[PDB]
Amino acid sequence: KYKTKVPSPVVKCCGATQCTSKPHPDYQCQVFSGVYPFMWGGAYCFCDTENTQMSEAYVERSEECSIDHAKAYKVHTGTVQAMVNITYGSVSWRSADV
């Protein structure tokens, strides 16, 4: 399973900050313009329309990848081994691997 890591967006109040491609799996950055953010303090950025938000997101392995995961394997050919029991005459069972 994947985990979409979403870092904190970069909100520039009266500016246009722009994307910079980062070496990350399925990395997406977008620069949505005209955002008037509201937060608990209320009025996050001054400029009514000339506000920019840079949102980025990238896929990682989920935390559970170390416990459940599918291993893809190429098989070609191998040893054939077997455990064998032998008795002969009065000798009892020996049961050794070959």
């Binding site: 399973k1 890591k5 979403v6 870092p7 904190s8 967006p9 970069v10 909100v11 520039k12 109040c13 900050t17 953010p37 937060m39 608990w40 303090g41 209320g42 009025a43 996050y44 950025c45 001054f46 949102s55 989920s62 935390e63 559970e64 170390s66 416990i67 459940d68």
Partner: protein, 262 residues
């Protein structure tokens, strides 16, 4: 063991983050659900919230949650701290930002708590599936049967390598730091905490102040002020603003990592 990881969470502060369903409407909530992880078996889920559990503003005590009433960082005793998907869930544990709970199948996840009269609740949609282990699709874990391997969330640290990324809070916005004084507007630094003001009196005025500073201007709604506190960490959440040069990460431990159990 338990003490040292709870000590370790003291660098992290709760935060107020946007939440879809607060009850009435969508608001900024102290208990905002960041992530629900529900890929374990037998209906055990891990909810990352915006509130610290088991911490007190001065120390650790596993009966206290801490959460922001604004910029106050107030700490209470866990009054209800209830998790429910379609019927109430059983709080298996709570550590740091995270709570581990056994939940029935559902189409919502709500976490909420009481601070005296006040009730803080946050619901996200996050459909939760009960995941039977084995070759019979049972709906609730049986009292007898067969012990089969299964994925469960630990309550004790296994030898951690699962980390949560943390950063210093950026420019926490607050307009209670603005007031009208005489005829101009006043920026009051609460205590030993910097404040960035951006005051568009018609000339663009701005700066960072460690003390009270009247900024001229006339109305309160020209003088947007931002609290800068860099003494705590917050989770690298998509619901929290960040600034341009705010890259520095923090790398705290995650409790309740997945493990294979029976």
């Amino acid at each position: 063991d338990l003490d040292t990881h709870f000590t370790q969470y003291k660098l992290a502060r709760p935060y107020i983050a946007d939440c879809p369903n607060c009850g009435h409407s969508r608001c900024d909530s102290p208990i905002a659900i960041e992530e629900v992880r529900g890929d374990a078996h037998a209906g055990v889920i891990r909810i990352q919230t915006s509130a610290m559990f088991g911490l007190k503003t001065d120390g650790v005590d596993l009966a206290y949650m801490s959460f922001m009433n604004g910029k106050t960082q107030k700490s209470i005793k866990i009054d209800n701290l209830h998790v429910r998907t379609s019927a109430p869930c059983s709080l298996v544990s709570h550590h740091g930002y995270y709570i581990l709970a056994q939940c029935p199948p559902g189409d919502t996840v709500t976490v909420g708590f009481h601070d005296g009269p006040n009730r803080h609740t946050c619901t996200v949609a996050h459909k939760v599936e009960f995941r039977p282990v084995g070759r019979e699709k049972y709906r609730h874990p049986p009292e007898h049967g067969v012990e089969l391997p299964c994925n469960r969330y630990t309550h004790k640290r296994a030898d951690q390598g699962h980390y949560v990324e943390m950063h210093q809070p950026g420019l926490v916005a607050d307009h209670s730091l603005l007031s009208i004084h005489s005829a101009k507007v006043k920026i009051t630094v609460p205590s030993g905490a910097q404040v960035k003001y951006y005051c568009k009196c018609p000339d663009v005025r701005k700066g960072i102040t460690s003390s009270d500073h009247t900024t001229t201007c006339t109305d309160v709604k020209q003088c947007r002020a931002y609290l800068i506190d860099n003494k705590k960490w917050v989770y690298n959440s998509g619901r929290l603003p960040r600034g341009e040069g705010d890259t520095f990460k923090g790398k705290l431990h995650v409790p309740f990592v997945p493990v294979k159990a029976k």
